[model samples]
Target chain A: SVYDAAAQLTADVKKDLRDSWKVIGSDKKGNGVALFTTLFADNQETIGYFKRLGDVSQGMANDKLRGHSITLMYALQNFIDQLDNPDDLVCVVEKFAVNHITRKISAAEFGKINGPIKKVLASKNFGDKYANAWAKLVAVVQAAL
Target chain B: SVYDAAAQLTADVKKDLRDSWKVIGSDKKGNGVALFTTLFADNQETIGYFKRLGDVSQGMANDKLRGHSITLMYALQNFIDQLDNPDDLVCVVEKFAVNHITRKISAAEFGKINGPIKKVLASKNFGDKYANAWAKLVAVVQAAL
Candidate 1:
């Protein structure tokens, strides 16, 4: 039954998220900067959407980038905290979608971050299992968007 | 600390919400129709934004209004479910703001709903305490927007 198709993070996946977040979320700004750095490296076109952070090609040390990076990490942390609560999770993601849509960002463009997210996760010693868990979570978010 | 200023529903307020919702939520469509009916009765200009619901002045038994009324109730239920989770609450309200912004609905127009909301609650025999609780919640939502 498609009734069973409700998107949810399994207990194991939630554990993986909590454990991995402890390491990555500790230095929210640094890790966020790293994630965006990788995202912008290959997805240069995406940077234009963040008009506040002009000329990130040279470096990612700008105050605007740092602030936005912190905001990104905090947003992810909020999502992680609400994994068990589907109603809140979907509501938060829907909110994110509305804001992004206003900026003309499509779902495909939003999905581009998954690549950088996985790359950063692997670099931090989060294995394929952890990466897979994140992909599942992202799928739920993208579906809502 | 000024940090205590974080907007939140107290246990009493949450109880107020849960208790009142049982009565109001049971007939979601009817109450929603009643609420909007009151809103449009006074603020006819606001009806222009809901172009889909053409000519509501004559009556309230329209399919589009019914669907939207149900949606509004469900959205309220989601908010009530997340009363303790401020992060999700803010995110959900922000999303609402973005969608409304796209429709050119100013904060003042959004605030107009509060009057109808209060009237509905009062008509259901909820006293000033319940009305005040809802007002506080709406204030938080409006500030986020």
Candidate 2:
């Protein structure tokens, strides 16, 4: 049931993100930056993982955070877009997982952001369907990680 | 001389961009939004072309500008990356030019951004060799545009 819900939300989330991202300006400033702010706000400690963000005097770290989040958002979009092709999704997710995992992401740390992200989607007017789907999706992602 | 210079720069420009872009943040702030701001500062009149930018008080337009500029930067990077294949570059440039032309870009307007961008690159600490190369690249892009 969780996989099924996750599978369905995978599609729904894409549609919701596509629509909601537009509402929030849909680019780095709105979607990506906003998402990262929420994630960091949820857990400021997570920001430390990116050594580049260490310089509190400079916004450079946050700038990188925005770019990094955009990359993740796009990657997730692609992954969601390619869901019909499980073969492609598998390869994409593996590359994504391997890339981040190597960058010091363990399952637990990776899992933490999902909650903040879910909150962001809801704040963006995603409603219960997308929210529930996001929950299921995170669980699956955590399991995979 | 202009045509010859442009043609020559086309080759040198890619090298210059590829090399210099690496020095800047190379991410959104450095490559995309930074260049646009420079271009706008250099030729504020050019900003009027983007009808969408008219709604600036909302801050929405600038956000879009950042995203759109980032897209342009990435596209430019890809075009530069594919320079080895003239066949590919031709197709890429043609498509790029056509897309912008439809979106209200003229050769002259497109050409205008080059000087400002060149200035930006230089200000970002690009040396003369790269600057000279960038000069040529702008010419080539103008010719293609």
Candidate 3:
């Protein structure tokens, strides 16, 4: 029953995220880049993790930034898709987490991106419920990291 | 410019389908089974293709039926995800189409399932725009078959 409750909660969170994304046009081109650009702008140091993106002075319009942004969006979306399968989700996140390990990306550093993401999401006025739900998801991600 | 029009149309169709599914509760468990079960029932001979699902005795409660139905729904959802990439979409469909061929499933037989799926979607009352978009999608699947 506990797993069921968690699963249902996760499903509800995903649904809310989906609905909010519809309003904010998450699927549109450059939208992911814009979100991550804001994120990188806020963190500044996180940009150093990307080999190509780190040197680009052109900012959000840079090819490397856009490519990496879309790639990350797809990666997060895949994690969301597998939320129903705990073991599989764990495996997926572990593989992803390991990629950051070599880059010396700390869990704290990984977690910082959540802030700008939440800030942007909050700006959409989708309500505190979505914000809290997203926090719950981010915590799961952090645990994996 | 040519790509833009096709991309817009694909996006419109996916959006309409997503909106319609929200209304029909099609994403819920057993709902997909019920829809596919109805499709198989309407085209009784088509049941020959599903190894475990063929003799389920006119019921959606069977475990095998549920598993197979969910698989079918996931397959269709993958198609929707790939619609923006025509080359990738074609490759995915061709792979699926080949599976049917090995099972002695003719293109005509494969196309029969679309009718019942469309019928169930139409009953959701999401309106003609949704219905037409779905038809366009079914046609794409049919052409692949």
Candidate 4:
């Protein structure tokens, strides 16, 4: 039933996601940079994967990081938008998985970011109900990976 | 007035763009691969920049290409959606420019895809008015680089 998390998306859960995403998605670059900054801080080895960031350790403040951050956030935006359509959501997530997997990132390695992502969400005051919904969505995505 | 092209997006022009894009944007991978395939056919050298898309010459059909294609098409979707808000349009374009330029891709080089993009639009039966509107938008994006 793990895969059914996407299908389990009720109207109320979808609204919670849409409402929270509206606030977080508005500052795509800022929030994205924060998410990745947290990601790289704890996982220095992961920084090597994103060659474009260019010296992220000094400070995650550059066009490359900003651009990548926006891209990452936009991917999430698309996922949230497609919550009502599980088939479409699966298609989108599979596309995302392909990109990472082709680069040698395993599903296990990819799932490692769950903690950092949740930390970022909690920092934004994402409530338990909303976080639980996100966890479900994330599980479906990870299963695909 | 080269920079003013974004501001020049009239209501009718925006509507035309949105309408045409609705059809073309739906199949992000197929159309995006078509655009890139055309680009590589004419300018093989450009393919080297996208290292992830391994063995593209054999056949531009793979997950890497699909992922990159979606990214490219999503960028255009964002641009089209922001037609009325030139300020946000500029911000988005600049972020895109940063990613490409940092990869050592020049403004002139980036502008070279204009033809392939137009050709793709035309193949979709995008009318003269819509194509012209797109040119204006592309010109503004290129100018920002």
Candidate 5:
């Protein structure tokens, strides 16, 4: 029930983002998807960001980043299977912040995205939820982007 | 279309497991969900078997034991998550094996579970499939033990 309520709220936030992405071109009339499908298919560069998302989300869900890294890894593989491109997938994830059904994630959550990701690998606060970043990530899922 | 094949295949497999489970328990009215549920849940020892099944199937999907280790790690975590008795979870993981899936362990695909698991930490090979024990997840979710 909580997850569903949270999911609905998250969806609303994504709806907002999907709407905004129309203006910003995350969709770009499907051009974004086309470009991304090409780039993400070959280059391994974005794997780092994919890894970063895993880094943090694992921290949030496992309560022990080292412990849950694998589930995030599995989930990401699942995500990749569904996507045509990693960059566009990233685009979707980013736009999801503003585009999906939920309409959540303020500037603060967006801001926390990077450094906290580094924190996961660095072992600074190993298991602790970088609450702000996690809040943003959950919103990333709001769109299921 | 992809999902249609998978969903139907899963359903058929579940039904087959249901039919087969009867013979395992002397053909005395056993159902797939009913039998696997107890062995899967109450028997902490068997979880390693299930995790082993998951990992090998993961390897088949990825094509290398080393390559898909992270995914195995996820299954391991899920195994932990599904612990019937949390106390034995660690030991089960430490000693997990695909041999329990059947007597046929692929020396070619997966090495002795212990050493290979360590190597899998660095690489991935998603090409190994164990359909019988692979059938366990459906059994797991359906029995809802």
Candidate 6:
């Protein structure tokens, strides 16, 4: 579920694109490419929300979590088009991934990325709950990767 | 695991990056930086190898069969790197994630990334089976991140 996030969102995004346009195989000019591919940062709370019935599983949850991370990053960078700091909407991902990677990850990078997580979170007055969350997250990601 | 293949990858790639570096950190960055990062594709092979290990589960063969996909992918990709068309390595992974995310197989990324592993079996050609192992991987990851 966590392996590839974009592919996971492709179905929904493709559907969105489809609903907005007919399946015209690009006009060959600049429009030949129906969708211009680009990288983006997502920051939508809505992205994190999964509209599902019951009977959910870990796979489902993992997908939803990554969907938000991936899709929200898109929203932040594209839809909102906000060009502020990387923390415009608040980033919890770098370190999240940092913890997952095995030995290739450098302590420097981990501390570098996580520094923002801790600083931003603390400054937000999010309190001990945030710290606890990051602690747990670190443990989980460390093992998974 | 699959969405736009590329987009989903972009979203969660940070995690992969983290894992990749972890492999490097461990000197398991066989080739470049694979080993720990790619936990999906090869997870399939592991299951396939393990299920049939009932005959030799009592010995070293058991251990070999229980090997991991990320590790295997690391090794295989390295071997593949020696080939002319190295891009095929990612192409193979992309095809897999795309198939699952498109919901063509009702595969929920990770499970698709895990359980029903499709080994590029040497026999005849290659085939997928309900391998069902790699649960430990899922559990550890689930706990970690």
Q: Which one wins on TM-score?
A: 4
lDDT of 1 by residue, B1-145 (tens): 1112125568898889889989897776579788888888888778888776566664445645654564566567656755776654554556455567777777667788888888999889998898888877777656744
Clashing pairs in 2: B9-B136
Model 6 over residues B62-112: C-alpha lDDT tens digits?
Answer: 322222222333332232221232232233344334423443333233444
DockQ for all candidate structures vs. native = 0.05, 0.03, 0.04, 0.19, 0.05, 0.02
- Please tell me which model should have the higher TM-score, number 3 or number 4: 4
lDDT of 5 by residue, A1-145 (tens): 2223233334444443333323333222123223223333443344344342243322223222322232333333333322333332343244233332333444443343334333332333323333332344444354342
Candidate 3 lDDT at A41 equals 75
- Which regions of candidate 4 are displaced past 4 Å? A1-72, A80-129, A136-145, B1-3, B58-60
Top model by lDDT, which number? Answer: 4
Question: What lDDT tens digits, residue by residue, belong to model 2 across residues B33-125?
Answer: 667766666787876776654443333135445435544555565455445654444434554555576677776788777676667767777
Please list, in the order the candidates appear, how each scores on TM-score for chain B only: 0.88, 0.76, 0.76, 0.87, 0.21, 0.31
Q: Give the least accurate 10-residue stretch of model 5 chain A, judged by summed lDDT.
A: A26-35
Docking class of 1: incorrect
Query: What is candidate 3's CA lDDT for residue B34?
Result: 68
TM-score of model 6 (CA atoms): 0.22
Rate residue A10 of model 4 by lDDT: 79
Docking quality tier of candidate 3? incorrect
Clashing pairs in 1: none
Q: Write the per-residue lDDT of candidate 1 for residues A58-100, one digit (tens) a residue.
A: 4445655654665567667666755666655555566555558
Local distance difference test values of all predictions, in order: 0.70, 0.56, 0.60, 0.74, 0.32, 0.29
Better of 2 and 4 by lDDT: 4
For model 2 chain A, the run of ten residues with the poorest summed lDDT: A55-64
Interface RMSD of each: 10.0, 14.5, 9.6, 4.0, 10.6, 15.0
Tens digits of per-residue lDDT, candidate 5, B1-145, equal 2122223344454454334323332221112123333333344443464452344323223222222232333343344233333222222222233222344433322322322222221222211222343334333322221
DockQ of 3: 0.04
Where model 3 places Cα greater than 4 Å from the true spot, the runs are A1-14, A21-25, B1-145
